[PDB]
Amino acid sequence: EREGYLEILSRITTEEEFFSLVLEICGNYGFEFFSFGARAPFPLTAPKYHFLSNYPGEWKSRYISEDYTSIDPIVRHGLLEYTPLIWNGEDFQENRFFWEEALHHGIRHGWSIPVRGKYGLISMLSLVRSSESIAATEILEKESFLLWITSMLQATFGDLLAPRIVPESNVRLTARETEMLKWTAVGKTYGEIGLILSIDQRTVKFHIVNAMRKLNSSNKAEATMKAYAIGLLN
């Protein structure tokens, strides 16, 4: 019965409601641990992650002290692939010090679902349990639903914490500013853009500086990458 959920998320307006709802859905389908992580496209060098999980307090603090995101293969699947993943904490060969430590906190049998979202958000819903591997008969029972709720969860989580982790989501670029960045994306100089758009060079640099301040960028190369990562150049 997925009809009742559509009204639940239509009224949720805080993290604690999101922290409580995903926890309730985590247990309603036979899972003890959940982890809804989102990867903002900023900063473009080392992007910032934001997780909301009920993992043990020792694990929620140890995951950040050693930068486990750079070695976690569960994060890697959501970054390069677009399909769900069924994983058992004992199968992975590399990063044994990470999995031998993760298996201690009851993070063994899990189900992670990567989804894309607005403003360049690469989110993923992960429901983990310390018992019973997920078989093919259990997957096809809840596969189509968990794919649907993952898109709905990240959609509400999107509009909820976008102004926090993606402050440039509220940026609106004018028609001139957008085409200035579209041509800066292909490495056009101010003079090359002038001949393309048939205006003066000082008018090309004009809209660039305004777009950089809107996107809170220090140069036009970073502003263009920022505008593209959010979707202002689609």
Binding-site ranges for ligand EVY (CB under 6 A)? 35, 37-39, 49, 51, 53, 55, 60, 63-64, 72, 74-75, 78-79, 102, 107, 110, 114, 122-124, 126
**For residue 196, which phi and psi values (nearest 5 degrees)?**
-70, -45
Q: How far is the CB of 138 from ligand EVY (least distance, A)?
A: 19
- 130 to 99, 104, 111, 113, 230: CA distances (angstroms): 13, 10, 12, 18, 37
Query: Which of 191/231 has CB closer to a copy of itself?
Result: 231
Partner whose binding site includes residue 10, from ligand EVY, a copy of itself, none (CB under 5 to 8 Å by kind): none
Partner whose binding site includes residue 156, from a copy of itself, ligand EVY, none (CB under 5 to 8 Å by kind): none
Amino acid in the structure at residue 192: E
- DSSP class of residue 234 equals -
- 180 to 199, 203, 207: CA distances (angstroms): 12, 10, 7
Partner whose binding site includes residue 151, from a copy of itself, ligand EVY, none (CB under 5 to 8 Å by kind): a copy of itself
Partner whose binding site includes residue 150, from ligand EVY, a copy of itself, none (CB under 5 to 8 Å by kind): none
CA-nearest of 137, 213, 127, 126 to 177 is 213
Give the integer Cα–Cα distance in Å for 20 and 18.
5
Partner whose binding site includes residue 175, from ligand EVY, a copy of itself, none (CB under 5 to 8 Å by kind): none
Give the integer Cα–Cα distance in Å for 213 and 227.
12
- DSSP class of residue 199 equals S
Give the integer Cα–Cα distance in Å for 174 and 208.
11
CA-nearest of 134, 141, 140 to 112 is 134
Query: Which of 62/188 has CB closer to ligand EVY?
Result: 62
Q: Is 42:168 a contact under the CB 8 Å cutoff?
A: yes
Q: How far is the CB of 166 from a copy of itself (least distance, A)?
A: 14
Q: How far is the CB of 126 from ligand EVY (least distance, A)?
A: 3
Q: Which residue has the tokens 């000082």?
A: 202
Q: How far is the CB of 179 from ligand EVY (least distance, A)?
A: 19
The per-residue b/e assignment along 128-137, b for 16 or more CB within 10 angstroms, e otherwise, is bbeeeebeee
Partner whose binding site includes residue 37, from ligand EVY, a copy of itself, none (CB under 5 to 8 Å by kind): ligand EVY
Q: How far is the CB of 37 from ligand EVY (least distance, A)?
A: 2
Q: How far is the CB of 222 from ligand EVY (least distance, A)?
A: 22
Residues that bind a copy of itself (CB under 8 A): 2-3, 43-45, 79-83, 115-118, 122, 140, 143-145, 147-148, 151-152, 154-155, 182-187, 217-222, 224-225, 228-229, 231, 233-234
